[PDB]
């Protein structure tokens, strides 16, 4: 797996107040992430069925 | 010239509490306005002699 399928990770989850649509009296929330990922060479792996 | 500001509006509504927002009140006038001054004046005279 290693080297299999890879995994791609750009920008951690991330919490911010988001200002704008937000008043002196409801606060707006947003949240966000940002991330992949793909096969490696897929001669590596292997897989069983019925 | 001076200030005279007329009314102050009525700005808050006593609203529900659960609406995010307020609702507009009415403004208020300030109304610059002006005034002049007068002016006061006259003469006399004299002989001299008929003074000393």
Known sequence: WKTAFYAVEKRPMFFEQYEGGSSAWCVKYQFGAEDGGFVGCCEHGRILQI | ?52
Do not use: S, W
Request: charged fraction near 30%; include cysteine; charge should be negative.
């Open chain 2, 1 to 52: 010239t001076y200030m005279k500001i007329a009314d102050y509006g009525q700005l808050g509504e006593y609203t529900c509490d659960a609406k995010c927002d307020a609702e507009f009140g009415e403004p208020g006038n300030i109304r610059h306005l002006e005034g002049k001054t007068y002016d006061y004046r006259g003469v006399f005279c004299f002989n001299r002699k008929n003074l000393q």
